[PDB]
Amino acid sequence: AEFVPPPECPVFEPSWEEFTDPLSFIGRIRPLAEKTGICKIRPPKDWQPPFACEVKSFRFTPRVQRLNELEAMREYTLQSFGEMADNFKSDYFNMPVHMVPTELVEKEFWRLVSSIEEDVIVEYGADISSKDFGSGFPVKDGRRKILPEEEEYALSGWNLNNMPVLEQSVLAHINKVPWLYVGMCFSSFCWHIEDHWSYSINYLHWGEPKTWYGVPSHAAEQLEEVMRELAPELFESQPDLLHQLVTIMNPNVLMEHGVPVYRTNQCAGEFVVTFPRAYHSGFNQGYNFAEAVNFCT
């Protein structure tokens, strides 16, 4: 009846030596991580970048998310979104936000997605460009002050602004930036893969965890087949890029049909990498702030 958590994906704790170059480290962990689709990477304890967005100006109108919309077939600052998000969660669970077990939010999320008796609606500050108010990482833009002790983070290969993003092509010889996600409890992203089957890297700057599910690329067609069988027939003929706007599916349904699924709780200061053609989806445990970019190898 209640949700059964998938097995945990790999977590890596690189030494300072291994942490020198992201692409080299990702290439070395690939034989394991590609078999789980997603992995988590914990930087060394002393690697702590400052938060570098323009907080005074940061304003956005999040999208509304009706958790049960398939089954059924306003403007905020960072501060005022946080107040709304914490009030929502503490009221929903009748306890302080940090006291709510991650497993309980997870079980309740999947219950609500399939419930026709209770219509829970949340908001997500999703797909906000780093160009609007800056990246959460420091950048040598000349647009914001960088303290000496922060320069190493502006120059780090793990700063998402410094990941390689240009794919090799003939058109490149003939002829972009990270996105931000301000989460609250139950805000979510449905199953998808990246454009061009790209890798992605995701960093949780601060706040409560982001819960992830991943499927390895060798099972991509299995997942697509389960979607074909069980996803709303009204949307069955839609191209993948549109279907993936609403590809909501409980991980246990995929697991029951033989699709390998792995989970993790990404906590503040931790990276999640998604491998090429690894389907993923997830939800936020509470008020948080993430940055993500597609990268090339």
Q: Binding site residues for Fe cation, as ranges?
A: 192, 194, 280
Applying CB under 6 A, the residues found at the interface with ligand DLJ are: 124, 126-127, 181, 189-190, 192, 194-195, 202, 210, 290, 292
Contact 211, 263 (CB under 8 A): yes
Shortest distance, CB of residue 94 to ligand DLJ, whole angstroms? 27
CA 258, 260, 264, 266 torsion-angle sign? negative
DSSP-based helix, strand, coil % in the chain, nearest 5: 35, 25, 45
Nearer residue to ligand DLJ within complex by CB, 159 or 202 = 202
User: What does the DSSP 8-state code read for residue 149?
Assistant: G
Q: List the beta bridge partners of residue 284.
A: 210
Shortest distance, CB of residue 183 to ligand DLJ, whole angstroms? 7
Shortest distance, CB of residue 177 to ligand DLJ, whole angstroms? 14
Nearer residue to ligand DLJ within complex by CB, 154 or 272 = 272
Shortest distance, CB of residue 174 to ligand DLJ, whole angstroms? 25
Question: What's the token pair of residue 234?
Answer: 């009204």
CA 201, 250, 225, 218 torsion-angle sign? positive
Nearer residue to ligand DLJ within complex by CB, 71 or 194 = 194
Q: Is 222 helix (H, G, I), strand (E, B) or coil?
A: helix
Nearer residue to ligand DLJ within complex by CB, 16 or 197 = 197
Query: Which residues are documented as binding site?
Result: 124, 192, 194, 200, 202, 210, 280
Q: What's the CA gap between 57 and 85, in Å, rounded?
A: 19
